[PDB]
Design a binder for this molecule. Structure first.
Ligand SMILES: *[C@@H]1O[C@H](CO)[C@@H](O[C@@H]2O[C@H](CO)[C@@H](O)[C@H](O)[C@H]2NC(C)=O)[C@H](O)[C@H]1NC(C)=O
Ligand SMILES: *[C@@H]1O[C@H](CO)[C@@H](O[C@@H]2O[C@H](CO)[C@@H](O)[C@H](O)[C@H]2NC(C)=O)[C@H](O)[C@H]1NC(C)=O
Ligand SMILES: [Cu+2]
Ligand SMILES: [Cu+2]
Ligand SMILES: [Cu+2]
Ligand SMILES: [Cu+2]
Length: 497
């Protein structure tokens, strides 16, 4: 069952074996992925997170981010450790109490402390629309139509050796899949459909790193939502989905009753489908309980290309229709060297005092804010443009902005900008060498908002900055509860800081 919008959520350690290999994990709700948190647009969510972690190998502190929810007036509830809060310590709990006005779509939640989400703290977060403009396009939309794609590691996140390459050991679809090496015939996930019905499949990348080439043998997929933003219908037969992105697509159960492979090919780790790696099963009601015998094409006919997506609503693009046509036009220098990433020459290292607390305590320019050179002020009520030229090692990098979605004025692998009708989203691949992926948004949400690569290993290695949006109005806009004010003293006492 789905939980929420008012719920407890316990964070525990447990052993799991999603690919047949047992290892300890950090879990929400006792499962991997965690349970779906759900409600309706505009609802009040009160997620009381109980930190019951005891195993220091995966960190006993935690903090949870609600990915893609704007948190307007509740920046303190956003979750990134040392940006909006100190972590919750073990044996304590914290109520993330926020509202979701004006948003409806497919989201997710994850630890936002270190690389802890890789150790298991990740799950779906759905905000339904009782008046969804897409409602007539499908018959079924429920917990059985959520599809999560996850990378899974045998080595614990904190134990990944300095200086060796990090790759996953299994792809998990709805929490199950097979290991790339020492493959065993562990159970695969089954997604069940009824011949003749149409399903809103909510595809969620909960990846710490790889992008996936997602497809379903014999079927095509009609995209209707991108990162929470309703889209015009776009029919594709493969979706390249980067870490933290979401799509809804209509699946029409219009093929013969049978079994079809669901494929999720990561860009690193095991290549292909031998032994049933990178796979799940689409099973029609009445089909034999057996593996599919289908194959993929050699070449997909209609892969998703991001410039083909357009909003359902008339969202336009803020600003003027040329490069630099914004109130605050920025170009970030994104680089990697010697194990660390940098933005404008500064590698992100989390500060001792969370950025929000520094602002509430009276630090009112971004030059005053720690870490020095990692916090950039944005002016209020202004059009912002951010160019994110690629080239840094470890790409393609999926950049994500908290507190906002944005127009993707320029996408990967295409030099032509779109100032008319590009998709809006919250996580975007910045592409390959020579690209100039560019985003735009307006600043109507005071507070410190993280901007970073969503490959968690890259965030850990410094690939981030904080946009301190409307510093002067942050305190008035974001009243804080006593429990939030209590977090840093409790954390600092427990850690002798
Ligand atoms: C990406 O686009 C930005 C503008 O959005 C380019 O920025 C300009 O960079 C040149 C130097 O390279 C400056 O002289 C301009 O002041 C910048 N802003 C402009 C023209 O609006 C940037 O060069 C582009 N990067 C790549 C790799 O194509
Ligand atoms: C590269 O991106 C551009 C800009 O998004 C795409 O150009 C648009 O193409 C559509 C479809 O033919 C036209 O309706 C628009 O008028 C074009 N806009 C602009 C600004 O040119 C283009 O299709 C993309 N290239 C590829 C190969 O997909
Ligand atoms: Cu996220
Ligand atoms: Cu986020
Ligand atoms: Cu990256
Ligand atoms: Cu983040």
């Amino acid at each position: 069952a789905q939980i929420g919008p008012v719920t407890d959520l316990h964070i525990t350690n447990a052993n799991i074996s999603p690919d047949g290999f047992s290892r300890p994990a950090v879990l929400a709700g006792g499962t991997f992925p965690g349970p779906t948190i759900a409600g309706n647009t505009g609802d009040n969510f009160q997620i009381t997170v109980f930190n019951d972690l005891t195993d220091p190998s995966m960190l006993t502190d935690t903090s949870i981010h609600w990915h893609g929810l704007f948190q307007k007036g509740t920046n303190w509830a956003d979750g990134p450790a040392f940006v909006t809060q100190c972590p919750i310590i073990t044996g304590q709990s914290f109520d993330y109490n926020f509202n979701v006005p004006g948003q409806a779509g497919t989201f997710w939640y994850h630890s936002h402390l270190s690389t802890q989400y890789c150790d298991g703290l990740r799950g779906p977060f759905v905000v339904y629309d009782p008046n969804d403009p897409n409602a007539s396009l499908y018959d079924v939309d429920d917990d059985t139509t959520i599809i999560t794609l996850a990378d899974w590691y045998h080595t614990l996140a904190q134990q990944e050796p300095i200086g060796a390459a990090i790759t996953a050991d299994a792809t998990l679809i709805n929490g199950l899949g097979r290991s790339f090496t020492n493959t065993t015939a562990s159970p695969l996930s089954v997604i069940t459909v009824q011949s003749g019905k149409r399903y809103r499949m909510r595809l969620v990348s909960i990846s710490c790193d790889p992008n996936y080439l997602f497809s379903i043998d014999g079927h095509d997929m009609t995209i209707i939502e991108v990162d929470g933003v309703n889209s015009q219908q776009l029919t594709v037969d493969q979706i390249q989905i980067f870490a933290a992105q979401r799509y809804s697509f209509v699946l029409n159960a219009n093929q013969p009753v049978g079994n079809y492979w669901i494929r999720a090919q990561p860009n690193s780790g095991g290549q292909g489908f031998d032994g049933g790696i990178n796979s799940a099963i689409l099973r029609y009601e009445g089909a034999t309980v057996e593996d599919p015998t289908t194959t993929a094409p050699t070449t997909f006919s209609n892969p998703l290309v991001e410039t083909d997506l357009h909003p359902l609503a008339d969202l336009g693009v803020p600003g003027q229709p040329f490069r630099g046509g914004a109130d605050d036009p920025l170009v970030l220098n994104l680089a990697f060297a010697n194990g660390r990433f940098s933005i404008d020459g500064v590698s992100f290292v989390p500060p001792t005092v969370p950025v929000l607390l520094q602002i509430l305590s009276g630090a009112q320019n971004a030059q005053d804010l720690l870490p020095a050179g990692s916090v950039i002020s944005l002016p209020s009520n202004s059009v912002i443009e951010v160019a994110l030229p690629a080239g840094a090692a470890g790409g393609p990098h999926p950049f994500h902005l908290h507190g906002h979605n944005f127009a993707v004025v320029q996408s990967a692998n295409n030099a032509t900008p779109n100032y008319v009708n590009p998709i809006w989203r919250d996580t975007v691949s910045i592409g390959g060498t020579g690209d100039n992926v560019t985003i735009r948004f307006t600043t109507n949400n005071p507070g410190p908002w993280f901007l970073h690569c969503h490959i968690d290993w890259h965030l850990e290695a410094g690939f981030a900055i904080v946009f301190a949006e409307d510093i002067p109005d942050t305190a008035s806009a974001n009243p804080v509860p006593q429990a939030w004010s209590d977090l840093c003293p409790a954390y600092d006492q427990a850690h002798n800081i």
